[PDB]
A paper describes a structure:
The importin [name] transports [name]-[name] into the yeast nucleus, where RanGTP facilitates histone release. [name] and [name] contain disordered N- and C-terminal tails and central alpha helices that fold together into the globular [name]-[name] histone-fold domain, with very basic surfaces that bind DNA in the nucleosome. Here, biochemical and structural analyses show that [name], [name]-[name], and a [name] dimer (Nap12) associate in the absence and presence of RanGTP to form equimolar complexes.
For comparison, we also performed cryo-EM analysis with a mixture of [name], Nap12, and excess [name]-[name] without RanGTP, which produced a heterogenous mixture of particles that included unliganded Nap12, the binary [name]•[name]-[name] complex, and small populations of two different assemblies containing [name], Nap12, and [name]-[name]. Excess histone in the sample had destabilized the [name]/Nap12/[name]-[name] ternary complex (more discussion in Fig. S1).
Author numbering:
A (entry chain B): 17 to 99
B (entry chain A): 1 to 293, 302 to 895, 931 to 942, 963 to 1004
C (entry chain C): 37 to 126
D (entry chain D): 81 to 365
E (entry chain E): 83 to 365
The structure:
């Protein structure tokens, strides 16, 4: 599939389908779903990295919601993006 | 011991003693928290005092735990750390309190919440035996509250490895199935077990590796046993002993069934089981509706889950009897409770918010909407026949009649086109029934509102298969408007406005009604909007703006138009939006209404429009002038409206001198004194347009003030986020006053450059590059001279400015702006200046090895690495990329060439270059990659 | 969404060799991902309309990202998108 | 030995001529024998048709095995070694709604053909793409008209995207006289023109497209090219002869292509279809 | 492999396919029976021609002018102009022509031109074959299917053995060998009643007259030692496989391959085609 070629774990096909069925535009470019998938995967990686750091500071090995909210709140850029 | 006194004081009424007790408690912890925690634990455990005293002791523990238990808490205070020996003590005490069913419910709940917090911080590294103790309690002592605690902590503590592989999952399922199979279990025990089962299903729904054979087999076995058991449970009956427990029990069963259906592969929960549970679910709808004879609330929740299941298995065929049962049950369930009727009738804004779909409440009405919206076409047509037949019989039973009309509304919202053998006769009868409902004099208010909202749906769904659709649409619309008028209920008026909005969706009213009746209905809708606008909540005002946007669209485009309608239209646009400028919907739709009200415009009409509108605005600007123009939603709103007028100039000339006389001085003051980002942004945009579109000879005396405002904005006395629109203002000043300003171009250009390089905001750099594009189109060589002679940090501004400009090209917005940038860059290219040839910019990124995602953490050691290319090469690459978005040798291509749109610009540019700039483009073409060469040559064909 | 969760697991395993994520935390992450997707897609739609262009393409996506994502998130999201597209289409 | 031949007396030469005449009579008797062979073989092809059709239905999934045939297959499995067909407990747990999601035997005929030694060499992947839609391979003996046998390949137009022909068939023809050994000798073969939906899906050719604005002829013109390529579907449209080119070029064409084509046809007809299932599973090797 | 690993639908379909294989195998058994019936029918037609040519060869029947003319036309069409008559040959008188009744060494020459069997022919065997008149073939109807070969020798004038006719038998396996044909089964043959060891071409003889040095008795010795020959075609390999013959069974299998090759050669080409191979045109 295209995601493997791009070097992405996220579902390029799912993103492309969502873009098309959302009727956001008459046409969806070939590179648009790849770019959007890369961005979403990057943001997921950021949030997961910071949540994992928060959990590891408590010496846990599990990211429960407390750690996730703590990581988002203590990171100004993510705080502004996600509240 | 003295902790008890503090508990009393903190638990007391008066502030002074409660504050004293709270402090005294805190300093003790600040000294040592060991004493306080030990004392509070002993208080909860042993005093046997008033239940309120123990409950408050537990509450204090709740508050103290987060402050002093561990740094893991955000609210942690470093004054002292709870002694380890005390930690074990309070853990033990909390377990003894929570697990013992005989304790009072308040004590158990307090202990449970404290345990939740402590476990969230301590399990499993600090508090190993938590799950051991909980499962010992559940298995041996049968502690029901232990099951509730386990349910609450399950997801926080039980990780995948323990669940699938540590045996915790199997142990939990053993507990659940032993509880459910045991015939003697009380309904409370079964409900707790079913909630714990929901927790297990959640855990099984997704896991790190689906393919693991052991995990797959475990999931299959658990799901099979669960479905068998739930099949057995639903067959039970309890002889009306406790209806609330039974309703909760059914609710949780169907929640679990929905979860299994929706979150696991279809290979589980085969179709035969789906049929069996469909029959059971229908029978349970009947049972619940009869039990209805907090009872109502629980009934409605159970109904939500049952109907959610039916929605999940709606693909199956439903027998005629099953459709009749479902329709009767939903008729009973979907009728409005007396409380909702009173709320809507007393405050129509709630009705408007719900009907427009803005209200957050989700209830059986919405779930019934979901069910009918999902049916397939054969079932949908049959159930439409059922609902229509029920409406035909229930035409004198008002209580059910609204429920039936809402069900019909839900059906008609289904995408599949209703079609059937006898539907045409049913549709004729239904149309007659709706006409009778409107004409009936004694009809209740809510039924009438539902009929009015439903009729548009009936007409839309059968836009085909209805003869004389146009007379029907005209008659129904006229009747609904006439009822909305000359009636004193805001429900009817708001419902009629929303019904009008529905009409506009499917019918071109101006064509359907004709120009005359179209104008008449515009006047009627305007009158209704005036009448209801006096009692509008925020959501109601948003809805009124939508309605008015619809009404304005139908005003005659003929050279003749009713000036009264235009005036009233603008009056409403300004009045409604002035009430609550902060409402986002009102602002956006006000801009829509104003734009389309100025869609096409000529001078004579404009002078009247500005004569009415603008004097209102100067009132607002002067009003805020006393406020020194601090931020105000109304101020921003009026600024946006002024920008809309200035943007929608009449094509037949420059702006009147009156607009200059009206707006210049107020805007001049706004830019001279305001200090907040948004206000200065909007004022700068409006002022730039005012300067740009006014006749030059009519404004030159004002040049001094213009430059004064510009110099204020350039000084950076206003922050960079402010003065965002200075670019366009400088462009306008240069365009109108090119000759008079020449001596000042150097300073203005250097200040603009200084702003451009430092800023990181995309919009600011775009606007500032607009100035460079203007100067380059006017005279490229002079722009190059200024940028090269100007110095920042001991480097010519050119290298920095060109690098910014090239990088900014990727993201500039707008057709005209893209074209402006293209022509500016084209001029730089043709100039073929050595100073430019020596400039170097950044090409593509060099990827690193592997597939690692580079986060901000890694950036320090994995920076973005570019490749360095001369400026002109990057110009050409940018243009080729643009061609690729829009849509094999140089010598042959050059020979091939010899023998207003973006693509037009780019193609003409390339042809001219290849013909003329032989050596510069030749070398670049020789270095372009083959895909680029192919796009370029294909475009050049 | 359920696919998003599995790919969240894969991304987590790449980010940390071994660490688990609760189901409710996974739902929260899926909510954030859907929110960002919606915001960027609507912004790209508006930009494509404003560019008078029928197609949402890498230009619209990049501009929407630059507009929405604060600070360094914008830079790194742009870098990731550009490098992903370069690996792709090549 | 020419000297010996000359040494034979005239009477012995007459006797040898009579013996040669007797050999010719034996040749006509062999002709009658071959005619009877062909007639009875056609009769037995009719006899085989029901079983072949039933197994084809089983392969395509149009029919489901009955318990009696299931037991007969099981007891046949107990004979020799076919325990692969013995159904295990795990499979019985499955439900028809889970198994019938795939109807028929995927790539049954493609696998059977690719397992055949001589023929599989000619099947390229591009040809194998069409073979995925192959669901039947039938035999027909040209009792009427010129003697020969015709191979039939069946497809579904609504399924395959390559051609609109539901059935593709190949024809082989023998001469009116028997061979020296008494076996049949071959005549030039013929094949059907495949009704490709479009040239792009055509598997026997390779195409190119270019546009010029040619200076040499001052023509704004578009050119298309087609080149035949090696492929199993070249098994059809066999070579034909033109006298002047036949003498020089096509002599080697008949020496090579006809031999390979005839061997492939014989291998199919004899080895493959009578043991189609064994060839599919490889027991026929 | 994986086909079995596929859900039981595929397994049951393949079981039905195997049942259809069994039904087709029964149909094919009846098919082989019909082929054997019609092969026997046409072998009944073959036999008269073979016997007539044998009569011509051994000289107890004479050609006819019409047959000679037809053979002349056939030879002219064949291009084998070596058989054409010449005026010099016509000059031969009847007395010279009748000095030999049959064709001298007809069968011997045909077998010498034969690819494989000629290798087995020795000089004494070549002398023997001059007494070979006819070669006959037959099909085995009872029990195991098979075919039988027969040779006719003029035992009256034969000074080597008294066997008027020698028959060689071949057998097939009970059921249908895979691929729709029959696989070989062991063969049996007759024993040659040689008149004496000196005239026995399957044996080389040694004559000794001795006075024993130990017992001082007077004795005359006739000694025997088998040798290879064309009649090793007879005394064929004993059994297909037996416990006591394994060491023998090695050579039995090798000679079985060789003898089945020879017999298939005979049946397919020699008995149906004898004139050309005597003349060598069939080479």
């Amino acid at each position: 599939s295209r995601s493997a070629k791009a070097g992405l774990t996220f579902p390029v096909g799912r993103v492309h389908r969502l873009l098309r069925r959302g009727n956001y535009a008459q046409r969806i470019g070939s590179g648009a779903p790849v770019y959007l998938t890369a961005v979403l995967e990057y943001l997921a990686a950021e949030i997961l990295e910071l949540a994992g750091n928060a959990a590891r500071d408590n010496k846990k090995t599990r990211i429960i919601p407390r750690h996730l909210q703590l990581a988002i709140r203590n990171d100004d850029e993510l705080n502004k993006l996600l509240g | 011991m003295d902790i008890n006194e503090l508990i009393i004081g903190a638990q007391s009424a008066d502030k002074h003693t409660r504050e004293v007790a709270e402090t005294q408690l805190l300093q003790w912890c600040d000294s040592d928290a060991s004493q306080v925690f030990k004392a509070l634990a002993n208080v909860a455990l042993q005093h046997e005092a008033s239940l309120e005293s123990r409950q408050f002791a537990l509450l204090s523990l709740r508050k103290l735990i987060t402050m002093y238990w561990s740094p893991g808490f955000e609210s942690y205070r470093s004054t002292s750390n709870v002694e380890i020996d005390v930690k074990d003590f309070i853990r033990e005490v909390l377990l003894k309190l929570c697990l013992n069913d005989n304790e009072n419910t308040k004590i158990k709940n307090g202990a449970s919440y404290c345990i939740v917090q402590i476990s969230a911080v301590d399990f499993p590294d600090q508090w190993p035996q938590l799950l051991t103790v909980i499962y010992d309690a559940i298995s041996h002592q049968h502690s029901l509250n232990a099951m509730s605690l386990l349910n609450e902590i399950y997801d926080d503590v039980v990780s995948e490895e323990m669940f699938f592989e540590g045996g915790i999952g199997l142990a939990t399922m053993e507990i659940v199935f032993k509880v459910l199979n045991t015939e003697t279990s009380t309904l409370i025990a079964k409900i707790a077990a079913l909630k714990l089962l929901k927790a297990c299903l959640l855990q099984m729904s997704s896991h790190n590796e689906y393919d693991e054979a052991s995990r797959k087999s475990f999931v299959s076995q658990c799901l099979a046993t669960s479905l068998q058991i739930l099949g057995q449970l639903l067959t039970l009956n309890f002889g009306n002993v406790d209806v609330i427990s039974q309703l909760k029990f059914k609710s949780i069963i169907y929640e679990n069934l929905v979860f299994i259906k929706n979150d696991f592969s279809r290979k589980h929960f085969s179709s035969e089981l789906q049929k069996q549970f469909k029959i059971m679910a229908i029978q349970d709808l009947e049972n619940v509706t009869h039990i209805n004879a907090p009872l109502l609330e629980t009934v409605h929740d159970c109904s939500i889950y049952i109907v959610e299941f039916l929605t999940s298995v709606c693909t199956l065929q439903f027998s005629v009897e099953e459709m009749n049962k479902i329709i009767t049950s939903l008729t009973i369930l979907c009728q409005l409770s007396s409380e909702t009727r009173e709320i809507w009738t007393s405050d129509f804004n709630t009705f408007v918010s719900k009907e427009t779909g803005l209200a957050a409440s989700y209830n059986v009405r919405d779930q019934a909407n979901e069910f009918f919206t999902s049916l397939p076409n054969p079932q949908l047509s049959l159930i439409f026949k059922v609902v229509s037949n029920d409406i035909e019989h229930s035409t004198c039973n008002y209580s059910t009649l609204e429920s039936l009309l809402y069900l019909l509304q839900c059906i008609l919202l289904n995408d599949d086109e209703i079609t059937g053998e006898n539907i045409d006769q049913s549709l004729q009868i239904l149309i007659k029934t709706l006409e009778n409902i409107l004409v009936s004099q004694e009809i209740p208010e809510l039924i009438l509102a539902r009929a009015i909202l439903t009729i548009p749906r009936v007409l839309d769904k059968f836009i085909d298969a209805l003869p004389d659709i146009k007379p029907l649409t005209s008659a129904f619309l006229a009747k609904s408007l006439n009822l909305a008028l000359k009636s004193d209920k805001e429900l009817i008026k708001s419902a009629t406005l929303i019904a009008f909005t529905y009409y506009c969706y499917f019918a071109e009213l101006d064509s359907v009604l004709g120009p005359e009746v179209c104008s008449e209905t515009q006047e009627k809708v305007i009158r209704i909007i005036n009448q209801v606008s006096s009692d509008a909540e925020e959501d109601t005002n948003g809805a009124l703006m939508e309605v008015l946007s619809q009404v304005i669209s139908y005003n005659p485009k003929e050279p003749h138009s009713r000036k009264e309608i235009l005036q009233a239209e603008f009056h409403l646009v300004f009045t409604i939006s002035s009430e609550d400028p902060a409402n986002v919907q009102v602002v956006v739709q006000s801009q829509e209404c104003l734009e389309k009200l100025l869609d096409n415009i000529n001078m004579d009409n404009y002078k009247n429009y500005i004569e009415l509108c603008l004097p209102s605005f100067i009132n607002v600007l002067d009003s805020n002038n006393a406020n020194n123009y601090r931020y105000s939603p109304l101020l921003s709103l009026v600024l946006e409206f002024i920008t809309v007028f200035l943007k929608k100039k009449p094509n037949d000339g420059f702006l009147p001198d009156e607009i200059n006389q009206y707006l210049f001085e107020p805007l001049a003051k706004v830019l001279a004194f305001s200090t907040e980002d948004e206000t200065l942004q909007l004022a700068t945009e409006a002022f730039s347009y005012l300067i740009f579109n006014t006749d030059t000879r009519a404004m030159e005396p004002r040049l001094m003030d213009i430059m004064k405002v510009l110099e204020r904005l350039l000084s950076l006395e206003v922050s960079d986020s402010a003065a965002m629109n200075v670019g366009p203002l400088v462009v306008a000043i240069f365009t109108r006053f090119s000759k008079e300003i020449q001596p000042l171009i150097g300073r203005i250009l250097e200040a603009v450059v200084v702003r451009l390089i430092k800023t990181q905001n995309i919009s600011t750099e775009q606007n500032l590059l607009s100035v460079l594009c203007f100067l380059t189109c006017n005279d490229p060589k002079q722009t190059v001279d200024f940028l090269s002679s100007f110095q920042i940090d001991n480097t010519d501004a050119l290298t920095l400015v060109m690098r910014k400009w090239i990088e900014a090209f990727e993201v500039i917005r707008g057709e005209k702006r893209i074209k402006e940038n293209i022509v500016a860059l084209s001029n730089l290219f043709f100039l073929n200046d050595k100073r430019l040839q020596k400039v170097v910019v950044n090409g593509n990124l060099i990827p690193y090895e592997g597939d690692l995602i580079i986060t901000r953490s890694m950036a320090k050691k994995m920076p973005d690495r570019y490749v360095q290319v001369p400026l002109y090469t990057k110009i050409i690459k940018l243009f080729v990329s643009e061609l690729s978005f829009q849509s094999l040798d140089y010598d042959k291509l050059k020979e091939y060439i010899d023998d207003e749109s973006v693509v037009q610009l780019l193609v003409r540019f390339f042809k001219e270059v290849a013909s003329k700039d032989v050596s510069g483009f030749h070398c670049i073409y020789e270095t372009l990659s083959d895909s680029e060469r192919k796009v370029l040559s294909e475009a050049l064909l | 969404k359920e696919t998003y969760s599995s790919y969240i697991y894969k991304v987590l395993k790449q980010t940390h060799p071994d660490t688990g994520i609760s189901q409710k935390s996974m739902s929260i992450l899926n909510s954030f991902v859907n929110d960002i997707f919606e915001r960027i897609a609507t912004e790209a739609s508006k930009l494509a309309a404003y560019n008078k262009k029928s197609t949402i393409s890498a230009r619209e996506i990049q501009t929407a990202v630059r507009l929405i994502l604060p600070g360094e998130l914008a830079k790194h999201a742009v870098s990731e998108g550009t490098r992903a597209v370069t690996k792709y289409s090549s | 030995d020419s000297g010996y031949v000359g040494g034979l007396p005239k009477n012995v030469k007459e006797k040898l001529l009579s013996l040669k005449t007797l050999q010719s009579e034996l040749f006509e008797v062999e002709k009658e024998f071959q005619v009877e062979m062909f007639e009875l073989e056609n009769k037995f092809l009719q006899k085989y048709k029901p079983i072949w059709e039933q197994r084809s239905r089983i392969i395509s999934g149009q029919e489901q095995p009955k318990p009696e045939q299931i037991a007969k297959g099981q007891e046949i499995v107990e004979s020799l070694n076919e325990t692969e067909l013995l159904v295990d407990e795990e499979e019985k747990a499955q439900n028809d709604s889970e198994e019938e999601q795939v109807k028929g035997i995927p790539s049954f005929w493609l696998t059977a053909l690719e397992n055949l030694p001589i023929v599989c060499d000619t099947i390229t992947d591009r040809d194998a793409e069409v073979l995925e839609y192959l669901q039947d391979i039938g035999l027909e003996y040209l009792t009427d008209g010129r003697p020969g046998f015709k191979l039939l390949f069946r497809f579904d137009s609504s399924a395959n995207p390559f051609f609109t022909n539901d059935i593709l068939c190949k024809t082989y023809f023998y001469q009116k006289e028997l061979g020296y050994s008494g076996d049949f000798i071959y005549d030039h073969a013929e094949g059907c023109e495949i009704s490709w939906k479009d040239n792009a899906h055509n598997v026997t050719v390779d195409l190119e497209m270019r546009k010029q604005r040619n200076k040499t002829t001052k023509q704004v013109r578009t050119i298309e090219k087609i080149t035949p390529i090696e492929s199993f579907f070249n098994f059809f449209d066999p070579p034909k002869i033109q006298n002047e080119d036949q003498d020089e070029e096509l002599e080697e064409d008949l020496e090579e292509r006809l031999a390979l084509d005839y061997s492939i046809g014989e291998q199919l007809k004899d080895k493959l279809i009578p043991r189609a299932v064994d060839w599919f599973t490889g027991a026929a090797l």
